[PDB]
Design a protein around this ligand. Sequence first.
Ligand SMILES: N[C@H](Cc1ccccc1)C(=O)N1CCC[C@H]1C(=O)NCc1ccc(O)cc1
Ligand SMILES: N[C@H](Cc1ccccc1)C(=O)N1CCC[C@H]1C(=O)NCc1ccc(O)cc1
Ligand SMILES: *[C@@H]1O[C@H](CO)[C@@H](O)[C@H](O)[C@H]1NC(C)=O
Ligand code: NA
Ligand code: NA
Lengths: 30, 251, 10
Amino acid sequence: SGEADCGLRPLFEKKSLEDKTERELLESYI
Amino acid sequence: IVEGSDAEIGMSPWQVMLFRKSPQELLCGASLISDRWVLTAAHCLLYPPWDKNFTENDLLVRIGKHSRTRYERNIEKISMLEKIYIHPRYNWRENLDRDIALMKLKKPVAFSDYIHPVCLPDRETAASLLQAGYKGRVTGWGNLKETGQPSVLQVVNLPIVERPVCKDSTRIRITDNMFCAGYKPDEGKRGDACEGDSGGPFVMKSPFNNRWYQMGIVSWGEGCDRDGKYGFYTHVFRLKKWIQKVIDQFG
Amino acid sequence: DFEEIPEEYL
Ligand SMILES: N[C@H](Cc1ccccc1)C(=O)N1CCC[C@H]1C(=O)NCc1ccc(O)cc1
Ligand SMILES: N[C@H](Cc1ccccc1)C(=O)N1CCC[C@H]1C(=O)NCc1ccc(O)cc1
Ligand SMILES: *[C@@H]1O[C@H](CO)[C@@H](O)[C@H](O)[C@H]1NC(C)=O
Ligand code: NA
Ligand code: NA
């Protein structure tokens, strides 16, 4: 269905790799 | 997307391209929310002022894409539509209130490294993250400038804007079913959605569970990347009851 | 401007 693993990208979260700008989002979540 | 950058491979695996069959052209963005459901803006399918009223057989969805114009053999997957559902109170007459539509695919799509669904936010995730200053991410193959078109999917991160500033930026009537995002003139940085990005997702990565959620749908703006203007997005959580009703009933 | 897609989908 996709429910259990929604929002977890195969090439990023699933492998514990970060994309080049996701940190900018995190830094804004104050 | 104006003033964005090229997406990384697999960066937005829920990104969907709505593609017109004849003539073959980009119609809109969209997002994958399960193996058989795609979310987009209602104005991508129905906008009578521009004589737009698409039926299921007019369109295809292309999932897993990166290049705008190439047929990405062995990577992208192309699906036909079983049925379109437009919000019954979508206000195409005035201000694009409730600018949301769902598309059910004829067959489930197989997930891959390039094809994977985004989550939709619960009340608490929405309340925590839909705050002025918090940034989300918009993606699409739309125009690079207001007045050309990209080789590959574009991405821009943009801050949510305070509701009074959104309201004061426009003469169009805003509603609780919308939010706006973008930098202010004094913030220096730039970026916006534009024509062709319609229907694509505004996503945020929850810092609580490290999952991506779709908070918004690219809906409307006045020009693209203009100083003192902001992009407007359908507020996905506010339309949860309708989304769930459609999927629970049909599926 | 777009590359032709396989006929199976049209
Ligand atoms: N310019 C109009 C304003 C309008 C709003 C509401 C009612 C009637 C008119 C508009 O933005 N329109 C018309 C209908 C489709 C929509 C549009 O083009 N969406 C693309 C877009 C561009 C930039 C963004 O940031 C986000 C999305
Ligand atoms: N029952 C399915 C299970 C399932 C979940 C996830 C993936 C695949 C399957 C489901 O609940 N679904 C399907 C896809 C959409 C979702 C749904 O309806 N969300 C309602 C909702 C919630 C919060 C919002 O902000 C907006 C809307
Ligand atoms: C749009 O298309 C459908 C089917 O062709 C039709 O029922 C409807 O009246 C049309 N116009 C709308 C919804 O404004
Ligand atoms: Na105003
Ligand atoms: Na602006």
